Amino acid sequence: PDSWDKDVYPEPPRRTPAPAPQTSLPNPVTYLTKIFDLLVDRPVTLAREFIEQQHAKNRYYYYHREFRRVPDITECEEKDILCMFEAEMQWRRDYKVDQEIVNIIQERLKACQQREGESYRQNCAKELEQFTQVSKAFQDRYSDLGAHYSARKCLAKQKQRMLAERKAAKEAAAA
Amino acid sequence: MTMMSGRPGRVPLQFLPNEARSLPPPKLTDPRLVYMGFLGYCSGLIDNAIRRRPVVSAGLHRQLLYVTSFVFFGYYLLKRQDYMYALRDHDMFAYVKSHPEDFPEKDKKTYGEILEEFHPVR
Numbered sequence: 505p506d507s508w509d510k511d512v513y514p515e516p517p518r519r520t521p522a523p524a525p526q527t528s529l530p531n532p533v534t535y536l537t538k539i540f541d542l543l544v545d546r547p548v549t550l551a552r553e554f555i556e557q558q559h560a561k562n563r564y565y566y567y568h569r570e571f572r573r574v575p576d577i578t579e580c581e582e583k584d585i586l587c588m589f590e591a592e593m594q595w596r597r598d599y600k601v602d603q604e605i606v607n608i609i610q611e612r613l614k615a616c617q618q619r620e621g622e623s624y625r626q627n628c629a630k631e632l633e634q635f636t637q638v639s640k641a642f643q644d645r646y647s648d649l650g651a652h653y654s655a656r657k658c659l660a661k662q663k664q665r666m667l668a669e670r671k672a673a674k675e676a677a678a679a
Numbered sequence: 680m681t682m683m684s685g686r687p688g689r690v691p692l693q694f695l696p697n698e699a700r701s702l703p704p705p706k707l708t709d710p711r712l713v714y715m716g717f718l719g720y721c722s723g724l725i726d727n728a729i730r731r732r733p734v735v736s737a738g739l740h741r742q743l744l745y746v747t748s749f750v751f752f753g754y755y756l757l758k759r760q761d762y763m764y765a766l767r768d769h770d771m772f773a774y775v776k777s778h779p780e781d782f783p784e785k786d787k788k789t790y791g792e793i794l795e796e797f798h799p800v801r
């Protein structure tokens with residue numbers, strides 16, 4: 505339905521064929537479907553209608569919490585505990601959001617593999633490539649930090665990688 | 680081995696210099712005073728138990744005197760202790776101020792410019 509964003513959770517246009525009977529025999533599946541409909545789906549729908557009638561009477565909402573952007577750990581001087589505290593809390597919240605991004609991408613991948621049936625190896629390549637890009641980025645940022653991770657250790661990992669990349673590019677320029 | 684015995688202008692046996700009166704006295708509900716009163720109460724109860732008297736009931740005037748004595752002495756103990764810590768901090772700050780070449784203020788770096796070593800956990 506419209507409850508969730510179809511841009512973050514997309515799906516193809518859902519092509520389904522029309523029934524083309526070839527025999528005089530009655531299809532027991534469709535009769536069972538009519539029986540199921542008129543014994544199960546209608547009482548359940550009525551119950552839900554009443555429940556939502558009672559819901560509409562008392563309507564209240566909640567709001568997603570928004571967080572400002574505070575200075576990160578790079579612009580905190582070495583022993584300033586308050587800047588360090590706020591930077592570390594911000595880094596932790598960002599780590600949580602990145603975990604959820606990888607989760608969304610993995611959900612897409614799984615849904616594609618199930619949906620595409622026998623053709624998943626070709627029809628889910630974009631989902632696989634998207635996951636590969638996200639996984640590579642997430643791995644660079646947080647892998648090998650260990651328990652007792654922190655923004656300072658993430659910064660040290662990034663700086664080590666940046667040094668290696670700079671030196672590699674410099675010796676490639678001499679080639 | 681004797682850091683504050685030789686301090687200048689110190690009266691031999693005062694226990695409470697006059698300069699100590701510039702400091703805020705401990706409140707009468709100071710939790711350290713309450714603990715001293717609890718110590719006095721435990722002394723009263725052990726007193727009853729040793730002399731084979733009912734432990735919580737026997738001498739109420741005696742237990743009151745125990746508690747009062749402990750609280751009374753603890754008040755002055757706390758005053759003297761807070762005063763001695765105030766002396767320590769006063770002297771330390773004055774010494775840091777008069778010897779600036781021993782306590783220099785060096786420019787501190789943000790973590791963006793300090794190169795820290797990374798150790799992977801694997």
Ligand SMILES: CCCCCCCCCCCCCCCCCC(=O)OC[C@H](COP(=O)([O-])OCC(O)COP(=O)([O-])OC[C@@H](COC(=O)CCCCCCCCCCCCCCCCC)OC(=O)CCCCCCCCCCCCCCCCC)OC(=O)CCCCCCCCCCCCCCCCC
Nearest residue numbers: 720721722723724725726727728729731732733734735736
């Ligand atoms: C960290 C968290 C907080 C911790 C708090 C601090 C620790 C506790 C406080 C310590 C001091 C307090 C008690 C000292 C005096 C006790 C002496 C005694 O004999 O007690 C008997 C006495 C009972 O005897 P009885 O009623 O006359 O009749 C009994 C029979 O006659 C028959 O009696 P009996 O004499 O013939 O029986 C003899 C008995 C007698 O044996 C004893 O009574 C042992 C007493 C040893 C005193 C401990 C030394 C000082 C305290 C140090 C605690 C150390 C803590 C750190 C870890 C170490 C663990 C010990 O010995 C034996 O039977 C042999 C057993 C041997 C087993 C080994 C255990 C021995 C050592 C265990 C020590 C455990 C800690 C103390 C536990 C509480 C004891 C009352 O105890 C009491 O009834 C009174 C206890 C406290 C009541 C007062 C409560 C305050 C008022 C109520 C209102 C609440 C206030 C808040 C208001 C709220 C708003 C509404």
Ligand SMILES: CCCCCCCCCCCCCCCCC[C@@H](O)O[C@H](CO[C@H](O)CCCCCCCCCCCCCCC)COP(=O)(O)OCC[N+](C)(C)C
Nearest residue numbers: 681683684689690691692693694695715718752753756759
């Ligand atoms: C197990 C706990 C220990 C109990 C200790 C016995 C407590 C009861 C003793 C009675 C208290 C009265 C003693 C002092 C009253 C007035 C005398 C006063 O003028 O003395 C001054 C000094 O004051 C006393 O020294 C303070 C005594 C306080 C002792 C309690 C501290 C215990 C440490 C932590 C345990 C908590 C105990 C809880 C209390 C029951 C003199 O200063 P000064 O002449 O220049 O120093 C001589 C020593 N020098 C030169 C080498 C430095």
